[PDB]
Amino acid sequence: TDVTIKTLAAERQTSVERLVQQFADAGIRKSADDSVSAQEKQTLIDHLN
Q1: Euclidean distance between the first and final Cα of the chain, in Å?
Q2: What span, in angstroms and rounded, lies between the C-alpha atoms of 48 and 18?
Q3: Are 12 and 33 spatial neighbours (Cβ–Cβ below 8 Å)?
Q4: Which 3 state secondary structure label does DSSP give 27?
Q5: How many CB atoms lie within 10 A of CB 44?
Q6: Assuming Cys at both sites, which of 6, 29, 34, 41 could form a disulfide with 15, CB separation 3.0 to 4.6 Å?
Q7: Residue 6 CB-density burial (10 A; 0-12 exposed, 13-18 middle, 19+ buried)
Q8: φ, ψ (nearest 5 deg) of residue 15
Q9: Are strands 36-37 and 2-3 parallel, antiparallel or unpaired?
């Protein structure tokens, strides 16, 4: 579940990478190569609404 952002970010490409950024704001690890959360892509929805 927990992986390092960027490698993971690339993985989804249009999900986890994005997820990490917003989430950092949310309450998860941030993007730009470092720490990320997979399947956290929900960031788009949660953060938005």
Answers
A1: 24
A2: 13
A3: no
A4: coil
A5: 13
A6: 41
A7: middle
A8: -130, -90
A9: antiparallel
* Number of independent structural domains in the chain: 1
Q: What are phi and psi of 38, to 5 degrees?
A: -80, 145
- CATH number where 36 lies: 3.30.56.50
Contact 20, 41 (CB under 8 A): no
Amino acid at 42: Q
Residues in the chain: 49
Q: Can you tell me the distance from the alpha carbon of 17 to that of 43, in angstroms, rounded to the nearest whole number?
A: 10
Closest CA to 39 of 19, 10, 14: 19
- State the structure-solving technique: NMR
